[PDB]
Structures are given as C-alpha cells and as structure tokens.
Design a protein around this ligand. Structure first.
Ligand SMILES: CC(=O)Nc1nc(C)cs1
Ligand code: NA
Ligand SMILES: [Zn+2]
Ligand SMILES: [Zn+2]
Ligand SMILES: [Zn+2]
Length: 99
C-alpha cells in the first residue's frame, strides 16, 4: 500500500451525522459488501455485488472510498490501497461505529 497519493486532497470533512457502517447501497439496497465515498459520503456496493461504487466513481470522478468490511481505503485512479495521517480520523470513527 502507498503512503500518499495525489487524490488525498479530495477527502472532505466528516459529516456531523457521523458514519453508519450498516447503511445499505443507495442504488440496489443490498447490505452485503458496501463502501463509503470520502468526498460526498454516499454508500454503494462493491464490484463483486452489483458494482454501484465503481459506477459512482465513473459518474462523479470522486477518487477514494472506504470499505465497511475491513476499513481499507482504495483509490480508483492509482489502482492501489492508501495509508496516510489524513485518513486516520475517518477510519477511527468507522472503527468505533463497527466494533
Ligand atoms: C480487502 C477487500 O477486498 N475489501 C473489500 N471491502 C469491500 C467493501 C469490498 S472488497
Ligand atoms: Na456480482
Ligand atoms: Zn448496489
Ligand atoms: Zn462521491
Ligand atoms: Zn490516488
């Protein structure tokens, strides 16, 4: 995994509403393998379900998403996982809600 990427600048402030790691996909309603977008905080399913987060990346350009299965952060441009200080606050809020 990368220690930085050029798309970290698109990570936006965490909503005052917080995160819900059990939130369903906004398109198909599945609860199975969802991601949250770190730009606008919408929730959509992974590529092995119905591919709605990949569709969201295509229609918005938003780069970075966080997994509600394992708290990994993926960049669709770099095609890599990313670790950086800028991601710690959102990962810690998700960890508290999940566990
Ligand atoms: C490591 C890995 O593949 N994690 C994934 N998390 C989701 C939500 C889909 S795939
Ligand atoms: Na599928
Ligand atoms: Zn879906
Ligand atoms: Zn987005
Ligand atoms: Zn990137």
């Amino acid at each position: 995994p990368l220690p930085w990427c050029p798309h970290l600048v698109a990570v936006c402030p965490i909503p005052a509403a917080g995160l819900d790691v059990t939130q369903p996909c906004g398109d198909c309603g599945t609860i199975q393998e969802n991601w949250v977008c770190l730009s606008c905080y919408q929730v959509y399913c992974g590529r092995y379900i119905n591919g709605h987060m990949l569709q969201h990346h295509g229609n918005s350009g938003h780069p970075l998403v966080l997994s509600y299965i394992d708290l990994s952060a993926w960049c669709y441009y770099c095609q890599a996982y990313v670790h950086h200080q800028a991601l710690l606050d959102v990962k810690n809020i998700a960890h508290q809600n999940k566990f």
